[model samples]
Target chain A: MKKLVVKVHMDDSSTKSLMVDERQLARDVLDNLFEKTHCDCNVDWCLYEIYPELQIERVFEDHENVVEVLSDWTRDTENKVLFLEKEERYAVFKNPQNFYLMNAKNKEYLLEESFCGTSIIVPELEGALYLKEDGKKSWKRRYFLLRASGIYYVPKGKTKTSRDLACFIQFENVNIYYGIQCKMKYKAPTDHCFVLKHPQIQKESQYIKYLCCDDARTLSQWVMGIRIAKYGKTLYDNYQRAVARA
Target chain B: HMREYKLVVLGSVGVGKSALTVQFVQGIFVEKYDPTIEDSYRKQVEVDCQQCMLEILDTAGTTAMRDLYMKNGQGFALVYSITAQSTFNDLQDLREQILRVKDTEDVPMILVGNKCDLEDERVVGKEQGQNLARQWCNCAFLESSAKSKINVNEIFYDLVRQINR
Candidate 1:
């Protein structure tokens, strides 16, 4: 397995660069690196990879100081990277890609404790599907059932520009997680809602454990959801106030 | 397209908010980069399998930076510091920022207890971390390291999966 690290040094977009072992697929490298770490969040030596701010940061690119700098970034918290394998399953189906979009009823996607599990909780959406784990030995998958926060949803047929608050459902093997894009208007016209999903839930085919974004909001009280939003995909980009209240 | 949700990062200074940003966005990590003033922003690739993309913003979180962000009302997520339970205890302060960002508690934020690997001199215990996170009503908590790259990327992927649905 190879190691990979893609960092956003600065948002200038011009400076963004992905660093990797370069010998393997980016995904595999990341997975392996994470595995070695055992998802340790506070290892002092792990900080070197967190602060590149950009792949080209001339001053700190040296191998020796990288670790030192990263460790320094989390000097107080003893924080480090959480390792997880890059489990991927390729789906090259014969069927044409299907295009779908959320009804945009401004449906209120609220996260609850019970929703964070293997079973479906709301029984609300017209059609619900559960995530099924890939049986193949080469791949692994975890079903979030949804994506929110740093991640944004652009339905099947919609152009990227038409992207809006996404709401949908997902399934893996027997496990299923549902995600929804909700927008609530606040001070200005922007409908500030949590672009979140149930990232992890423990369950035994019959019961579900955790949910992301909403239930996450209820769990970590929106701490986990927002923290990852730093990368730039989970949160919706539109400042247009959600139609929920408008 | 059904776009489920949006997420943001928040936390104290040097809490590795930027590191989380790097691991999740580029699928790689860099040890050091100059910390520039004026909060950072970007649209990144989600190395996650659940969804297509996760757009994130790495905001400043130091006392000085936090004070500045408080007035700006920018950014959606909140990442906290893990070294101090006192930092972990600042959930309310984070909530206040979220409310300010959304202008209401209607929006949710994810609470992350960064740096979980350091077991020796841990100031914030797992129980306390979960307890505080539970008390604040955050979505979920995961200890991350950009170096070891633990659940580091999964956090972004999971969040994207949540957003995709």
Candidate 2:
């Protein structure tokens, strides 16, 4: 196995160097860091990739390969990987009601106390969304429904029944990303936009789907809802493991 | 026949990489300093009697998705601002990484010194850019001002020509 050196920044403006296996998962790396520091193991402790220039950051999922994530960095990239304790890393798991029950149309499938283990089911979200047309600036309002399998949109003048719904995209092949400046780029009605695209696509293509919401809260709900729909029980399991380790 | 060019604009944070790109693609110079997202733009340009479609990827100078950009980019504009010395210093490693990722020393590239309109605040001289370009296997070099629209079109045009060659 190949090994490489990585520099990790702590919360208190301190840094440490570690030599890690290239193929190790992010959970293993986090465990290694905990062992070396001998610090209190909190469930909230996470490894984050911070882009200082863009003022954006994201927590590394437990299943992600550390080396594959590091491969995205250039040799002299100013971006930093920090090991910090943030409660928001697993905020959705901690309070699923805030994410699922807020705007869900079918909330009976989601039980507040049953979020542990495999009992967690993603609630269905249905609403009118502005979908950007392919290779054009025009956006048309469409009725969208989110299920466990994929997203479905009601066709023109069709009822929101299962048989009448058309598949817009599926959750198996695409990842969700928050749009940064949609108003300036796409002439979106608001800055609250999200994108669904394949992981391999790095540029603008016709395959990428762009959706806009009326406000920030709606955007967050949709993003979190899609994440829950995609990951499902794995997300709850990851949270359980983290709590157990702590 | 229409050809497609995959070009990337790369540099340090606040180095005017997006400014040069937006000016070239949209023909409008934005004054406010809004940090760029990982945005891509398409513009059709007529280069040397042949119509070409340029797909430009403007980055936020983030590391999370840079390797994908570098892996897919056929040509690159390693930009730096003439007003800041650190921005100019940040280009060497970016260039090295491109060469390493592409696994070739002869990749199509350009070294751009942006913000030339801010000559009063310039710290990185014109000679510095030319000297560095010469050191890097004789890559093309130019002093550009996106605000003033100086050499913005030429930067992409030259890269397209080099990619064609």
Candidate 3:
């Protein structure tokens, strides 16, 4: 039973030191923090692992062991963990239509269920994206298709048939990260760039996949579509657990 | 129906795993650090009259999420730089970790010696990779140069064939 101390920051810019067991999960750490800080525990309350250098943040999943997750940090890393209240953390579950109803054709089906039932259906997302070329600042428009298994694209001059479709990326081992300063950094057509990358990649690397959307609406659709497609019913379960805990 | 293959590329830092992966997925050789990329690359290929989509994951930076990568990966390309000895030495532990994470001895894996174009700077010999593959169960071996595009397609095609079997 190894013990460790960690510094957690709050939204108010106040910091707290909490001693935790190495085996404690994120939820357990959250509970411990809530006890120490004298704050009411709620579903909106989350512990976020922020990579300051990368300009990206992710909520620590409840099941993840806190120490194990922190072990991935570099020895001289500037990364820090934060305990904050974020209402939008579970926003997708609260308003399913906003995420799944990009196309009017599927609005009726999504509205009927609204993910209240046992199984949640993630609407298929297909559209055109400006895919950035490898090691170059150039962008090309490609028609992309999304399914439960992965993202596919119709090759140039090819029909959108299953035979002609090419796989863009899959959701299983990857997470979608909203890109910051992408327009300046990658010379993207728009600032609405989102990256699909491994969860553990904390810093900038050549393996990060970049895709740009024309606007914030399209970007949200693609990002939320990926979340729904990747997490599926488990996302609902997470929502339920958060609601129950709250 | 199209089959999805979850492939992972594992190696030490600077082993050209990303270069090999990008070459196969995007058909371009990247010499500089782009710092913006894919979690896994998906490419459609025809293997033995069947359409297969290979979602290849190339890793860099850290190993904190390596277990998740190993658990989700159906096949793996254990890559090493031919120009570096430490990179070659790193694969044994990575393979062991994969087996431990997957909890099986028989896994679809390929021993890849990347940067074959750097022959003048070669530290590990081709026979070293071949001998290691022979020692591992049901593993294939190949030397590839992502810059020169040597065996880039075959490396993934061979993995797909291995998974098919």
Candidate 4:
């Protein structure tokens, strides 16, 4: 839930370069996220921690699932959103009653791991987050974090580049920085998945009783995420544990 | 190699076979890129303490499609992968390509269990991957990791030595 200050500017050709204000952004985004996700409770006195809220942050991601969600996010502006690419595969849990599933030979997977909130520093106010793409550089717009939502509204035309646009949210006292991968593809079992079974997987599916490669892998994956609001600076620091040592 | 030789590196598509070559020849740390489309050919080189003349080939990782690249066996056959355990499991596939493509009993093979720097997370043992190498390559084996640059040099020198022998 840390904020990354993105200061954007347009270059000679109009491509944008991005730079993050980690120290300040991290504190603000994380703080906002913490408050939004946990603390204040109801009659049940139920309070969720930062750990679980992260799981439900975004509804649609722009990485491997790009095909399913990107164009909409790209052309539209009204829907609240923040898209990060982690490129890490999370375990694809098969619903007990799903139509089909990938019979994974391995139990563990890494999905949407290319980018995570913990991966980069949160962006701060003006002159903070800089985007360098599309040959245009411009200042990234500033916005506040909405509870249960990471996307903030920036009046159109304020965006620096069509490719790399940074988002900032101030949840109460927290600042969060995030960006949607301008270029991403939504991968699904090719049209081949609709077929009963391709020759390539005929033998494996027959004996294995389930398909776990290529197309079959798609059915096994689902869209799941977490989010928070009213974040204060101290909330996001603890989320860095999942990073794989480079 | 004092003399020019063709070396084909292969493994399961996502097994870091490309990273192994990057670390071994180009001395660059490469991040795993997305679903790289195969069905294309590239001309590259491998440089080290000595500039060895070489032709490096990159191919897709699949059981059915593996035959496409395996058929080209004019140089040393190096079977390498990121996870140690995979290097062991993929042995039969590696040897099959060498035997069928090269049509020669000998290709001077070596089993390299890459990503050795991740000893803490290592699931396969040095002995296990090596045992398979001995059966196929009939030469010594080594544990390496492109990430940490472990045993990357030894594997190179060893390959040349094996070819020369």
Top candidate by TM-score: 3
Report fnat for all candidates as fractions from 0 to 1: 0.11, 0.00, 0.00, 0.00
lDDT of 2 by residue, A69-109 (tens): 77766666677788888675566766667775544533323
Q: If you superpose only chain B onto the true chain B, what TM-score does each candidate give? A: 0.70, 0.97, 0.93, 0.74
lDDT agreement with native, every candidate = 0.38, 0.79, 0.78, 0.38
DockQ of every model listed? Answer: 0.06, 0.01, 0.01, 0.01
**Residue B79 lDDT (model 4):** 53
Worst 10 residues of 3 chain A by lDDT: A102-111
Model 4 residue B101 CA deviation in Å: 2.6
Error of 3 at B15 (Å): 55
On the 0 to 100 scale, the lDDT of residue A75 in model 2 is: 65
Better of 1 and 4 by DockQ: 1
* lDDT digits (tens) for residues A45-107 of candidate 1: 121122122111111111222232332342243222322211110000010011011222322
RMSD (CA, Å), each prediction: 25.5, 17.0, 23.9, 21.6
Give the fraction of true interface contacts kept by model 4.
0.00
Per-candidate TM-scores read: 0.35, 0.49, 0.52, 0.36
Off by over 4 Å in 1: A1-246, B1-7, B33-51, B63-77, B161-165
Interface RMSD of each: 6.9, 15.3, 16.4, 13.4
Local accuracy of candidate 4 as per-residue lDDT tens digits, B37-104: 33121223344454555545544455555555556534443555535455568667667667777677
Per-residue error at B145 for model 3, in Å? 72
Poorest 10 consecutive residues of model 4 chain A by lDDT?
A: A8-17
TM-score of chain A of 1: 0.18
